[PDB]
Amino acid sequence: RMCKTPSAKFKGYCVSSTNCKNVCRTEGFPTGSCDFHITSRKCYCYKPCP
Numbered sequence: 767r768m769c770k771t772p773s774a775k776f777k778g779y780c781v782s783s784t785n786c787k788n789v790c791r792t793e794g795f796p797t798g799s800c801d802f803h804i805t806s807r808k809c810y811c812y813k814p815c816p
Contacts, residue, residue, distance in 0.1 A: 767816065771795060773809040780807040787811070 773780075776789040780800045787798035790811035798811035 767814075769813045769815040770810050771813045773798075773811055776809055777806070780809045783809070 773786055773790055773793075773795075775793060776786050780786055783798060783800035786800055786809040790798040790809070793811075795811035795813050798809065801808040801810050
């Protein structure tokens with residue numbers, strides 16, 4: 767399965783998605799993408815799940 771996971775170590779200002787990817791790929795998420803700010807600016811990276 768493929769899951770979506772909010773960047774745990776990246777919260778606040780998501781200036782660029784590529785910057786977020788660095789954090790996400792360090793945590794263990796191959797694919798990363800920045801989203802639109804609802805309450806705060808979010809970043810959602812994807813995690814391969816069983």
